[PDB]
Each structure stands twice: as C-alpha cells, then as structure tokens.
C-alpha cells in the first residue's frame, strides 16, 4: 500500500496594475486610535505594474523557526578525586541557562511540543608530571530521575540499578546518543511566564520555578578505574518538534541576570546619531 499526501505551497500576494485616480476614496487616511493596522498596498498610493510573485514564506513558519538543536547545559565530572561529589554530574532540567534558545522561546507565552535530545561527551587527561599509559575505552551512564525518585549519593550507590528509571549507556568513539521525549506537563501547555505565587497567602516562591518540576539528570563513569585521573565534560542539546505556540510577546531587550527571575538592569532604547536629520553621504568622487 502507498498513500499520496498533498502539500499546498503558500506564496505571497501578487501586485496588480493600477492607474491614475481622482475620487473620494481615501485609502491612505486612517486612525491608529482604533488599535487597527492599515492594510494598504503600494497599488493604493502610486501607479504600479503587474508582477507575478513566486516568493514563499516557508522558512518563517514556527516549526522551521524552532526545529534546530541548541545547547542547554554543560557539566564536568571526574574519575578520581577526594570529594566523591565531583565523581558524577547532576542538574535540574530546564531551558533557562543558555541565552540564545531561551530568548528564542520567550517570544511566546505558552508552548507545546515533543523534544529530541542529544548528548555530546568528551574526555581529557588531567595534568600530571608522569604521563604514559594505555587506557581501555570509557563507558558513561546517563540516568533521568522524575520528581520523587531516590537520589544517588555516590558513584557506587544502589540507585544506579535503574530498574524503572530510563538510562543510556554509551562508549566513546561512537555516534552521539539521542532519544525523543513526549509533551510531559500536568497542564495543557508549557508556561514561559507566570505572574503568581506558590502559596495561597500571596507569598513564597514567585514566577517560573513554581510550575516546571520536571526531574533531574545524573551522569557518571562506569569503569571505576584510572589510577591516573581523567575529566569528562557532557553537553546537552534540545530540539523541539510538533510545535504549537500562543500569545506572542515583545522580544527581550535587556540582558539576562540569572536563571530564576526576569531581573534586569535598565538599558537604552538604541544608540545615538548626530541629529534628527543626519544622513551619511555615499556618492562622492
């Protein structure tokens, strides 16, 4: 069986031919007080020729705009140390620490989508005086813990049994690991802004951290080895797909300060020029 699926191409409007006019129709006179934006084209104000326009608005749809991978977290962890908390990495899941993807997401109030997640892991040797040894390939474990699950205390804790938590095992020299996640929220859509509190007495925690609660990630080395110490760095990449967004907002002007708040320092509207009439001259012999 084969099924033919049709794809409607969507191009921009053609401009029509127009001639001289002398009448009572005033397309160029409006009133912005109504909250309405004028729908006037060049053919209403000047004389125009007919043009057949073949341009398409395909790369500005929301799906093509948001469906690319971006880094959201980077972290380090060791194979040998004297701290036992630096032997594994762990963090809470969100998209608020890297400013590019998070400014791109905050153009809208609410978003809903599935996700594709990729990891990029690299290792390196720690600076020691005596070098020289052959080491077998390293293996890494990534575990996702939804809220309420037990938390590892070390790299040999029983919790890495991962009986019900989903985990990834990977070894260096292969393709980067990848998996997809569905839309997981107790609400009908994700919320990027929340003008409210956590306690009914209008106090407690304000803003975004009240609503996310999506678990944690833990990463470790599996070998448990290496008399000479090594160091690994893990980077995580998000890619949304099957997207829907609501209620657009003005883009962020000020620089970000931290991952919890919308706090900012006052910034200008733009940079200056000489005077309200200044023109740069570019046609000179």
């Amino acid at each position: 069986v084969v099924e033919a699926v049709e794809n409607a191409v969507a191009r921009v409007a053609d401009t029509i031919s127009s001639g001289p006019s002398n009448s009572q129709a005033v397309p160029a006179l409006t009133a912005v007080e109504t909250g309405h934006t004028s729908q006037v084209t060049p053919s209403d104000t000047i004389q125009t020729r007919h043009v057949r326009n073949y341009h398409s608005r395909s790369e500005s749809s929301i799906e093509n705009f948001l469906c690319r991978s971006a880094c959201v977290y980077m972290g380090e962890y060791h194979t040998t140390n004297t701290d036992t908390s630096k032997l594994f990495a762990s963090w809470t899941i969100n998209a608020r620490r890297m400013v590019q993807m998070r400014r791109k997401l905050e153009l809208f109030t609410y978003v809903r989508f599935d996700m594709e997640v990729t990891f990029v892991i690299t290792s390196k040797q720690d600076q020691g005086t005596q070098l020289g040894q052959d080491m077998p390939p390293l293996t890494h474990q990534i575990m996702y813990i939804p809220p309420g699950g037990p938390i590892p205390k070390s790299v040999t804790d029983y919790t890495w049994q991962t009986s019900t938590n989903p985990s990834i095992f990977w070894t260096e020299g292969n393709a980067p690991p990848r998996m997809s996640i569905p839309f997981i929220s107790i609400g009908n859509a994700y919320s990027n802004f929340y003008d409210g509190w956590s306690h009914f007495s209008q106090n407690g925690v304000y803003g975004y951290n009240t609503l996310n609660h999506m678990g944690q990630i833990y990463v470790r080395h599996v070998n448990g080895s290496s008399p000479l110490p090594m160091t690994s760095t893990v980077r995580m990449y998000f890619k949304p797909k099957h997207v829907k967004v609501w209620v657009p907002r003005p883009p962020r002007l000020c620089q970000y300060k931290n991952a919890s708040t919308v706090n900012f320092t006052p910034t200008n509207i733009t940079e200056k020029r000489q005077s309200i009439n200044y023109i740069p001259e570019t046609v000179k012999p």
């Binding site: 049709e6 409607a8 397309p27 799906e63 099957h242 657009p248």
Partner: protein, 59 residues
C-alpha cells in the same frame, strides 16, 4: 506497507519522496516542516466593526 509519498520542496519559474514510520509512538516521528497556514487578521484587525480601507475610519 504503510508508505507515504509526498512532493519535495523545489523552485519555480522524480520530485516526490517516500517515508515509512518505524516506531509505535508518534513522538518518534520527524518534524512537520511542510505546513504553511496563516491568519494575520487575529493580530492586525482585532476590531468589532469592520473597516473597509477605502472609507474614512471615523465619522
């Protein structure tokens, strides 16, 4: 065998492709890159009474 055949993105002035789904969950499918709808009047003309654009806005 549950195959979908659809047209490719080309220019203007052999052109279709085939897809099979391998997994049981729809969250595993690839992105929907070929849907192009618009409704700008929701943001540019959100008024109760219609405005003709050749008539005055008031009076």
């Amino acid at each position: 065998m549950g195959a979908q055949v659809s047209t490719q993105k080309t220019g203007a002035h052999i052109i279709h492709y085939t897809n099979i789904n391998y997994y049981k969950d729809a969250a595993s499918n690839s992105a929907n890159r070929q849907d192009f709808s618009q409704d700008p009047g929701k943001f540019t003309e959100p008024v109760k009474d219609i405005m003709v654009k050749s008539l005055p806005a008031l009076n």
